[PDB]
Amino acid sequence: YPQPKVLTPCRKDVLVVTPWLAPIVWEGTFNIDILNEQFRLQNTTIGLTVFAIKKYVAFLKLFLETAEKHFMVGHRVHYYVFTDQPAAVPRVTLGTGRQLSVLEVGRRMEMISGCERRFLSEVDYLVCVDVDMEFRDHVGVEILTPLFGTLHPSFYGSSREAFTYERRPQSQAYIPKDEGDFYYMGAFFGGSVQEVQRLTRACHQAMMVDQANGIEAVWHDESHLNKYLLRHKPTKVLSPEYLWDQQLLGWPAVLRKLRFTAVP
Amino acid sequence: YPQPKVLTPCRKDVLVVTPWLAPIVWEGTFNIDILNEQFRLQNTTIGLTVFAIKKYVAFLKLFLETAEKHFMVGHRVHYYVFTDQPAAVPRVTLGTGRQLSVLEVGRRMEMISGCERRFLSEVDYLVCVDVDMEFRDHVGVEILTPLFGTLHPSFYGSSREAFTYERRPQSQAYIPKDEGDFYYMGAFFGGSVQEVQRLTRACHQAMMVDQANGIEAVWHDESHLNKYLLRHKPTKVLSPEYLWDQQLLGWPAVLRKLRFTAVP
Ligand SMILES: O=c1ccn([C@@H]2O[C@H](COP(=O)(O)OP(=O)(O)O)[C@@H](O)[C@H]2O)c(=O)[nH]1
Ligand SMILES: O=c1ccn([C@@H]2O[C@H](COP(=O)(O)OP(=O)(O)O)[C@@H](O)[C@H]2O)c(=O)[nH]1
Ligand SMILES: OC[C@H]1O[C@@H](O)[C@H](O)[C@@H](O)[C@H]1O
Ligand SMILES: OC[C@H]1O[C@@H](O)[C@H](O)[C@@H](O)[C@H]1O
């Protein structure tokens, strides 16, 4: 493969590492051939969780079809579809080493943390995404790490005081005006099974505390996710390539690939 | 602390992450206040190993004095001094939480891997350096990770075919002319106790295989270190700030700090 050269950076236009030395994942920062080999040597299995409740079942077909084309191809994958309509889950043909389970539900942080023993035995990593999305380009093992969050596409150019963090100190999700690294979106986070269960257990415990206190955070689980990732910093951060809306935000030059996008 | 901004990189002049998404540690890439807190929450202990055999005992005083000023200050540190002259080890006054053991020896990879149970109980990380050096600036927890190597200061601007890897396929250290990421120096490597014992055990086993075969690698343990770190890629790479010789190479602009340097 091409020899990396220490005096020529590959991307000079964007921050590629956080101040706590976590990679920020942009096209041009990674050689996928190297990463794929490292992960295949461990026989890595990746869990992908998706909720499709009520009308949101309609999003599953495209979601799964497109995951088959772009998500962890070559690796073992277990889709977990949480739904109130198990008969509405479309039958999508999967690649080898890939499987899907339908979990019937009667919330997300709760539901993710007691499927607890199940995830620990079956997968190495867990990835938690919104269903009303499609994959348009490669989303692979470059994202895998103990704990990651994703930069919210509306706020990646913003200063922290503009971040729509929870601001009432009454709320467990509270983050002061002069604190904060990034604004992460709740639509795409993950990590090791152990780290995702810690995060979701913490968010769940914090939401219950707010509830028993008569307050709900301004952006609900996304508020608590941001407070967690402030105090427990992610080991990788995904760039907005991994969570975008072309309709609302177009295709700027700084995004070489649009990998996982909102469905119009 | 200052808010990192995703569209303004802190260093645009150098590569700050490897193609396998390991940070390359340069001044300006890390907020030490954040790192120090993360490491202190774990009560981290760092082991530092140094060989001082024959005339090399003369280097210890400056080495230790300067480590006290610059190496992991605020953290727990255990110096391990391997020497054939235990009475020649200077008595240097240490900061709180810091200790030194003198290990008498009658090689390095061997000696590091059977002090094996001893390191596993006493430290979390191990750092292995040459003694004829001095610390001139901060060398701290930014370097800590499962496995790291350091860019050789003579070869960081070089193409791979110029790297003085072992080139005879007769040798276990053999690396083909079209392979290779970097040229790491043997003078400064480390990692978790488990990873450093794996590396040193592998290098030791590989050296014995070459010996039983009548061949010694061109640069001896540094050759085997480079072959190991090719096949087991480091989780961080230290920039030349961490291993320099001002006499031979000066002080280029791209080095904002000269942290650990050869003694003239
Ligand atoms: O009626 C609903 C509401 C929410 N969701 C799940 O939770 C996510 C977020 O819901 P919301 O509509 O508030 O956010 P959106 O996805 O529209 O940005 C959805 O993607 C689904 O994955 C669902 O399945 N059914
Ligand atoms: O007589 C010796 C030779 C080597 N060394 C140890 O192994 C390192 C490398 O030895 P060499 O002189 O070959 O390399 P140098 O340090 O001069 O670059 C030294 O720093 C010491 O830490 C030693 O202690 N005594
Ligand atoms: O400010 C936070 C909000 O930003 C909106 O753009 C987004 O649609 C919401 O889901 C939430 O993330
Ligand atoms: O080419 C490899 C060699 O480079 C020299 O500059 C150095 O003094 C040696 O210790 C060895 O690392």
Side-chain angles (χ1 to χ4, degrees), chain B residues 152 154-155 164 183 185 219 222:
Chain B
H152 189 308
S154 292
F155 296 95
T164 67
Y183 192 80
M185 189 159 193
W219 293 98
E222 172 172 291

Side-chain angles (χ1 to χ4, degrees), chain A residues 20 34 45 72 78-79 106 142 161 166 177 210 217 228 235 259-260:
Chain A
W20 58 93
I34 296 172
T45 305
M72 307 290 174
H78 203 149
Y79 301 101
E142 77 279 354
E161 65 275 11
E166 181 45 69
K177 279 280 172 180
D210 272 10
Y228 191 82
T235 57
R259 313 167 182 276
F260 187 49

